[PDB]
């Protein structure tokens, strides 16, 4: 079991180049199952989930390869049951279902894996596909969908906002007969990116980025070339790294408009932030950040994917701040671990009350999920002494070369293989 051994304290400062969004690359890779011509996807991060997705697509019969850019030729896909081992290791696998039923009339996928930060049901994906005409049966952990002929467009009012289900419905709708209107659609930047990728292939979609997406189905999608947008969560993670470090960082290959809420909160924490067309700089001017109150919610509000990181920020900030997590019900797994490092926090229902301390102490901590793992590594960088983060495999799912990137900022980190 690989771990990260981190020696602190170290001030993280310098520059970092942001990789493509984990969460845009993934839905785009699965959306490629709809493509009847080859596609080249550029700026795809080298992440465990991307590798898993490529193997999954290959096992469905698509020709897949990469390198910098990922190439997919799904013309001859001929297997419609996603392999269990690949499906259970990440959340993104659920996205193989919609394209398979929309293009081939059938698809079978086991319930997905991914961070265990909640029960994470897929009822909205199922309900959406059923509204488009699919028949779905759940048996022995597999979601089995089928339709005789094409799906048919429908006016779907999502009764809960969901990033993943919005993607499932939007992608499947592109091959349906007629027009689909998705109400209460998730507005995340990755939904916009996925929609634009689909449009590149010939899909007819509008409203992406708003609560109402309209899709006019077409007979078939072609191919194309598309570059994935920057990872806003990786960007926020490194901005937080600089903030808690009382340092400065410039993030290159960034997309500032995907982070309005996060940047505003960092300014509230005392950060001096500037933005360019494709970069973001943060400078603490050597000052300890000020605690902030945060409430997570769907985009454009503060993202749940930055919650663990801001929990860390508050725990070393001046004063008391709270973070209310409204999106997932089991996303405070990092709190007990940070407490092992000297943090002062109390959990009250869906809110963590943080009381910042001057400095954390190194300790043996356990990564419990993706964003928690990144938060513990950052904690290790600023803590006094040695920190060992166990089960760091979690970090490889969403951060490309975080070890190298942190080292370039001044971190003393070593990946230790086998205890
Ligand atoms: C691979 C990927 O893109 N992952 C991101 C995506 O996941 P994901 O797509 O799973 O996020 P969702 O938006 O769907 O989940 C949000 C909330 O809706 C619930 N829900 C979701 C689907 C469903 O069918 N029924 C249901 O009840 C969830 O369990 C959760 O309580 O968005 C999340 C929220 O911004 C991020 O934190 C994840 O990193």
């Amino acid at each position: 079991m690989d771990k990260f051994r981190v020696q602190g304290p170290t001030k993280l400062q310098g520059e970092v180049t942001i990789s493509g969004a984990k969460n845009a690359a993934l839905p785009i890779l699965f959306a490629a199952l709809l493509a009847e011509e080859p596609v080249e996807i550029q700026n795809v991060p080298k992440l465990k989930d991307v590798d898993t997705s490529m193997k999954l697509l290959s096992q469905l019969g698509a020709k897949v390869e990469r390198x910098g850019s990922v190439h997919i030729d799904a013309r001859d896909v001929n297997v419609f049951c996603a392999p269990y081992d690949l499906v259970k290791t990440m959340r993104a696998s659920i996205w193989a279902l919609g394209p398979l039923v929309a293009r081939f009339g059938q698809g079978q996928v086991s319930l997905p894996g991914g961070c265990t930060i909640g029960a994470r049901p897929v009822d909205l994906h199922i309900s959406g596909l059923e509204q488009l005409g699919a028949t779905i049966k759940l048996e022995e952990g597999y979601v089995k969908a089928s339709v005789d002929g094409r799906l048919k467009g429908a006016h779907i009012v999502m009764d809960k906002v969901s990033v993943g289900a919005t993607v499932t419905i939007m992608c499947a709708a592109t091959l349906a007969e007629g027009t689909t209107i998705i109400e209460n659609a998730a507005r995340e930047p990755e939904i916009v990116d996925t929609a634009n990728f689909l449009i590149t292939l010939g899909a007819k979609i509008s409203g992406q980025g708003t609560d109402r997406i309209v899709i006019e189905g077409v007979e078939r999608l072609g191919g194309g070339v598309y570059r994935v947008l920057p990872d806003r969560i990786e960007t926020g993670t490194f901005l937080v790294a600089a903030a808690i470090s009382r340092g400065k960082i410039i993030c290159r290959n960034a997309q500032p408009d995907t982070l309005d809420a996060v940047l505003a909160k960092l300014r509230d924490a005392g950060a001096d932030i500037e933005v360019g067309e494709d970069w973001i700089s943060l400078d603490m001017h050597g000052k300890r950040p000020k605690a902030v109150n945060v409430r997570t919610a769907p985009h454009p509000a503060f993202p749940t994917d930055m919650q663990a990181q801001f929990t860390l920020l508050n725990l070393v900030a001046e004063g008391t701040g709270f973070i209310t997590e409204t999106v997932f019900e089991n996303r405070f797994m990092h709190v007990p671990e940070l407490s092992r490092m000297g943090a002062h926090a109390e959990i009250e229902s869906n809110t963590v009350i943080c009381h910042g301390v001057e400095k954390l102490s190194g300790a043996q901590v356990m990564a419990t999920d993706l964003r928690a793992s990144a938060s513990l590594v950052l904690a290790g960088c600023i803590a006094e002494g040695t920190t060992v983060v166990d089960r760091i495999y979690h970090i490889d799912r969403g951060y490309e070369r975080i070890e190298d990137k942190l080292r370039a900022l001044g971190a003393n980190i070593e990946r230790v293989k086998g205890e």
Side-chain angles (χ1 to χ4, degrees):
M1 184 63 76
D2 283 16
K3 317 176 194 315
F4 267 172
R5 178 160 56 200
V6 185
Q7 309 288 175
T10 61
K11 181 174 179 179
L12 302 175
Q13 63 199 325
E15 285 188 38
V16 62
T17 293
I18 303 304
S19 298
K22 168 197 183 294
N23 297 333
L26 293 172
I28 282 167
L29 290 170
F30 284 96
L33 284 165
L34 302 163
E36 285 173 39
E37 294 291 338
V39 301
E40 171 172 280
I41 307 168
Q42 305 169 345
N43 195 40
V44 175
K46 292 181 184 64
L47 309 175
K48 183 71 159 57
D49 285 11
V50 169
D51 180 57
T52 300
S53 297
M54 285 175 73
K55 293 187 295 180
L56 199 166
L57 294 172
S58 183
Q59 286 183 39
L60 292 180
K63 293 170 186 180
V64 183
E65 60 162 358
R66 74 164 306 161
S69 296
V70 174
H71 301 297
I72 297 167
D73 180 349
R75 283 177 292 175
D76 297 341
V77 159
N78 65 344
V79 170
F80 316 118
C81 176
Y84 183 85
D85 62 305
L86 303 179
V87 169
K88 285 290 179 187
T89 202
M90 66 185 174
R91 179 70 173 172
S93 53
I94 186 59
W95 290 317
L97 189 67
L100 289 177
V101 71
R103 181 178 167 208
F104 301 101
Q106 69 172 103
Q108 304 90 224
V109 319
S110 294
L111 291 171
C115 298
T116 57
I117 53 179
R120 307 186 75 177
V122 295
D123 59 296
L124 300 169
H125 297 251
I126 290 171
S127 180
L129 293 171
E130 281 173 337
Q131 290 181 60
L132 289 178
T135 292
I136 294 179
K137 70 172 176 182
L138 307 307
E139 67 175 55
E140 302 195 6
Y142 274 76
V143 179
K144 302 194 178 184
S146 62
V147 62
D148 191 47
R150 287 172 73 184
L151 291 173
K152 293 186 182 178
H155 196 168
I156 301 172
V157 181
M158 297 185 71
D159 55 38
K160 269 181 52 62
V161 174
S162 164
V163 170
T166 293
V167 168
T168 285
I169 300 166
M170 177 174 70
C171 295
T174 66
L175 293 186
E177 185 186 320
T179 298
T180 294
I181 298 180
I182 305 175
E183 306 274 5
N184 297 325
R187 294 138 67 165
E188 269 69 8
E190 297 80 20
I191 295 294
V192 170
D193 216 39
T194 299
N196 291 339
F197 167 66
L198 291 166
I199 290 172
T200 303
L201 307 183
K204 294 169 180 178
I205 303 167
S206 63
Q208 60 270 31
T210 78
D211 67 312
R212 182 183 178 270
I213 301 175
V214 181
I215 303 97
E216 189 193 323
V218 299
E219 286 197 8
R220 58 150 275 173
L221 293 192
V225 179
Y226 192 81
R227 181 194 174 85
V228 178
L229 94 173
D231 194 310
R232 63 195 165 96
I233 302 307
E234 185 189 25
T235 302
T237 300
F238 284 107
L239 290 171
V240 166
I244 66 184
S245 280
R246 311 191 189 181
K248 178 182 179 178
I249 189 174
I250 300 183
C251 295
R252 306 289 184 189
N253 282 16
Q255 186 173 318
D257 73 14
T258 61
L259 290 160
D260 289 354
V262 171
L263 298 188
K265 286 295 179 188
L266 290 169
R267 292 192 195 92
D268 295 338
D272 171 16
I273 295 179
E274 308 188 20
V275 303
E277 174 181 59
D278 61 357
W279 57 265
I280 302 174
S281 67
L282 178 154
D283 192 346
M284 295 305 294
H285 293 289
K287 305 309 175 186
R288 176 179 173 183
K290 303 297 181 180
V292 293
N293 294 335
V294 179
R295 178 177 184 282
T296 69
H299 192 76
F302 185 99
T304 176
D305 276 356
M306 287 300 81
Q307 180 259 106
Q309 300 94 310
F310 268 70
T311 295
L312 169 60
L313 181 150
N314 272 346
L315 295 169
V316 298
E318 185 63 57
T320 297
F322 71 76
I323 299 193
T324 296
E325 175 53 83
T326 72
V327 182
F328 286 103
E329 77 271 27
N330 183 220
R331 205 171 196 168
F332 283 152
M333 297 188 277
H334 52 287
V335 180
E337 301 306 306
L338 289 167
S339 292
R340 294 171 52 60
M341 301 180 70
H344 295 166
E346 300 87 47
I347 291 170
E348 298 181 354
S349 191
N350 68 355
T351 300
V352 57
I353 304 292
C354 307
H355 309 286
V357 296
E358 184 63 42
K359 59 190 299 179
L360 301 177
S361 296
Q364 293 187 65
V365 291
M366 176 68 73
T368 51
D369 57 85
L370 176 52
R371 310 305 167 181
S373 77
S375 299
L376 295 177
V377 170
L378 292 188
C381 295
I382 61 168
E384 181 64 54
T386 307
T387 293
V388 178
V389 183
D390 196 7
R391 293 188 185 156
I392 64 164
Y393 66 87
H394 285 286
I395 214 163
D396 299 327
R397 293 186 60 218
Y399 295 86
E400 176 185 307
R401 301 170 57 252
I402 196 173
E403 191 189 325
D404 295 314
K405 294 181 182 181
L406 284 169
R407 180 168 300 119
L409 294 168
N412 183 326
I413 170 176
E414 192 190 325
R415 175 190 277 275
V416 303
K417 303 180 178 180
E419 297 292 343

